[PDB]
Design an enzyme around this catalytic site. Structure first.
Site, PDB file in Angstrom:
ATOM      1  N   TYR A  28       0.739  -1.259   0.000  1.00  0.00           N
ATOM      2  CA  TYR A  28       0.000   0.000   0.000  1.00  0.00           C
ATOM      3  C   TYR A  28       0.770   1.311   0.000  1.00  0.00           C
ATOM      4  O   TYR A  28       0.228   2.338  -0.418  1.00  0.00           O
ATOM      5  CB  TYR A  28      -0.980   0.020   1.176  1.00  0.00           C
ATOM      6  CG  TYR A  28      -2.125  -0.941   1.006  1.00  0.00           C
ATOM      7  CD1 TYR A  28      -1.984  -2.291   1.323  1.00  0.00           C
ATOM      8  CD2 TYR A  28      -3.335  -0.509   0.476  1.00  0.00           C
ATOM      9  CE1 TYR A  28      -3.033  -3.191   1.113  1.00  0.00           C
ATOM     10  CE2 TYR A  28      -4.381  -1.390   0.257  1.00  0.00           C
ATOM     11  CZ  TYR A  28      -4.227  -2.727   0.574  1.00  0.00           C
ATOM     12  OH  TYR A  28      -5.265  -3.593   0.330  1.00  0.00           O
ATOM     13  N   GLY A  30       2.531   3.755  -1.558  1.00  0.00           N
ATOM     14  CA  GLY A  30       2.877   4.173  -2.900  1.00  0.00           C
ATOM     15  C   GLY A  30       1.600   4.298  -3.703  1.00  0.00           C
ATOM     16  O   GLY A  30       0.509   4.092  -3.168  1.00  0.00           O
ATOM     17  N   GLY A  32      -1.549   3.583  -5.679  1.00  0.00           N
ATOM     18  CA  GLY A  32      -2.388   2.401  -5.665  1.00  0.00           C
ATOM     19  C   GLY A  32      -2.220   1.563  -4.411  1.00  0.00           C
ATOM     20  O   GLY A  32      -1.627   2.002  -3.424  1.00  0.00           O
ATOM     21  N   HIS A  48      -4.291   5.265   5.251  1.00  0.00           N
ATOM     22  CA  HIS A  48      -4.106   6.533   4.561  1.00  0.00           C
ATOM     23  C   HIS A  48      -4.798   6.494   3.194  1.00  0.00           C
ATOM     24  O   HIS A  48      -5.431   7.465   2.793  1.00  0.00           O
ATOM     25  CB  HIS A  48      -2.608   6.817   4.404  1.00  0.00           C
ATOM     26  CG  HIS A  48      -2.300   8.162   3.819  1.00  0.00           C
ATOM     27  ND1 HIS A  48      -1.794   8.321   2.547  1.00  0.00           N
ATOM     28  CD2 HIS A  48      -2.415   9.407   4.338  1.00  0.00           C
ATOM     29  CE1 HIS A  48      -1.608   9.607   2.309  1.00  0.00           C
ATOM     30  NE2 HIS A  48      -1.977  10.288   3.379  1.00  0.00           N
ATOM     31  N   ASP A  49      -4.679   5.371   2.485  1.00  0.00           N
ATOM     32  CA  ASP A  49      -5.324   5.221   1.178  1.00  0.00           C
ATOM     33  C   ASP A  49      -6.850   5.329   1.341  1.00  0.00           C
ATOM     34  O   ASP A  49      -7.521   5.994   0.549  1.00  0.00           O
ATOM     35  CB  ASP A  49      -4.986   3.858   0.550  1.00  0.00           C
ATOM     36  CG  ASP A  49      -3.574   3.796  -0.044  1.00  0.00           C
ATOM     37  OD1 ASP A  49      -2.790   4.756   0.115  1.00  0.00           O
ATOM     38  OD2 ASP A  49      -3.251   2.761  -0.674  1.00  0.00           O
ATOM     39  N   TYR A  52      -7.989   8.902   1.914  1.00  0.00           N
ATOM     40  CA  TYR A  52      -8.017   9.689   0.684  1.00  0.00           C
ATOM     41  C   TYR A  52      -9.261   9.372  -0.142  1.00  0.00           C
ATOM     42  O   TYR A  52      -9.848  10.261  -0.755  1.00  0.00           O
ATOM     43  CB  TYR A  52      -6.765   9.415  -0.152  1.00  0.00           C
ATOM     44  CG  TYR A  52      -5.595  10.338   0.144  1.00  0.00           C
ATOM     45  CD1 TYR A  52      -5.521  11.053   1.342  1.00  0.00           C
ATOM     46  CD2 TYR A  52      -4.551  10.480  -0.771  1.00  0.00           C
ATOM     47  CE1 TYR A  52      -4.441  11.883   1.622  1.00  0.00           C
ATOM     48  CE2 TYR A  52      -3.463  11.311  -0.501  1.00  0.00           C
ATOM     49  CZ  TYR A  52      -3.415  12.010   0.698  1.00  0.00           C
ATOM     50  OH  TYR A  52      -2.345  12.835   0.969  1.00  0.00           O
ATOM     51  N   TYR A  73      -2.678  22.577   1.258  1.00  0.00           N
ATOM     52  CA  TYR A  73      -3.337  22.960   2.501  1.00  0.00           C
ATOM     53  C   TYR A  73      -2.259  23.567   3.392  1.00  0.00           C
ATOM     54  O   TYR A  73      -1.067  23.476   3.079  1.00  0.00           O
ATOM     55  CB  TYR A  73      -4.004  21.748   3.182  1.00  0.00           C
ATOM     56  CG  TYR A  73      -3.083  20.589   3.486  1.00  0.00           C
ATOM     57  CD1 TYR A  73      -2.071  20.702   4.441  1.00  0.00           C
ATOM     58  CD2 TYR A  73      -3.214  19.380   2.809  1.00  0.00           C
ATOM     59  CE1 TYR A  73      -1.209  19.636   4.710  1.00  0.00           C
ATOM     60  CE2 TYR A  73      -2.355  18.311   3.069  1.00  0.00           C
ATOM     61  CZ  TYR A  73      -1.359  18.447   4.017  1.00  0.00           C
ATOM     62  OH  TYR A  73      -0.510  17.396   4.272  1.00  0.00           O
ATOM     63  N   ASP A  99      -3.224  13.059   6.279  1.00  0.00           N
ATOM     64  CA  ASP A  99      -1.768  13.096   6.233  1.00  0.00           C
ATOM     65  C   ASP A  99      -1.147  13.116   7.624  1.00  0.00           C
ATOM     66  O   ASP A  99      -0.170  12.411   7.889  1.00  0.00           O
ATOM     67  CB  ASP A  99      -1.291  14.324   5.444  1.00  0.00           C
ATOM     68  CG  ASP A  99      -1.590  14.218   3.950  1.00  0.00           C
ATOM     69  OD1 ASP A  99      -2.042  13.147   3.493  1.00  0.00           O
ATOM     70  OD2 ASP A  99      -1.364  15.212   3.228  1.00  0.00           O
TER      71      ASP A  99
HETATM   72 CA   LIG Z   1      -1.178   3.591  -1.582  1.00  0.00          CA
END
Ligand SMILES: [Ca+2]
Length: 123
Positions: A28, A30, A32, A48-49, A52, A73, A99
């Site tokens: 995960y 990176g 995709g 985190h993915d 988003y 931001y 983040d």
């Molecule tokens: Ca990712």
């Protein structure tokens, strides 16, 4: 945006170059991501993915063309502490939080070099 996220991780881990150290790690960390996380650091990236993806579900984000990776931001790093600014509008504030959570997550888990540049065969 990517450059702010880079700065946040450095805020927590001053000795790293995040775009190098935490990119292409596990399934995960990176662009995709799929499969089962290989370790806790990888799970930080999965969370985190998902954060988003949730951000792009918000009505406040679907109004701007700015992508989570390019949408700027405001935040500050002080005494190795991350603070998302109140000046941030709805979308930017959500991204900032995603983040911040990931940067903190990264700093609390083990780093396994064996999972660096992992073969997508495992994902
Ligand atoms: Ca990712």
């Amino acid at each position: 945006a990517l450059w702010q996220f880079n700065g946040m991780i450095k805020c927590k881990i001053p000795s790293s170059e995040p775009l190098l150290d935490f990119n292409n790690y596990g399934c995960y960390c990176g662009l995709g991501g799929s499969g089962t996380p290989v370790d806790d650091l990888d799970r930080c990236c999965q969370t985190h993915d998902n954060c988003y993806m949730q951000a792009m579900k918000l009505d406040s984000c679907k109004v701007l063309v700015d992508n989570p990776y390019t949408n700027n931001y405001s935040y500050s790093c002080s005494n190795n502490e991350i603070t998302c600014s109140s000046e941030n509008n709805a979308c930017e504030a959500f991204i900032c939080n995603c983040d911040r959570n990931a940067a903190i997550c990264f700093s609390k888990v083990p780093y396994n070099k064996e999972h660096k540049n992992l073969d997508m065969k495992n994902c």
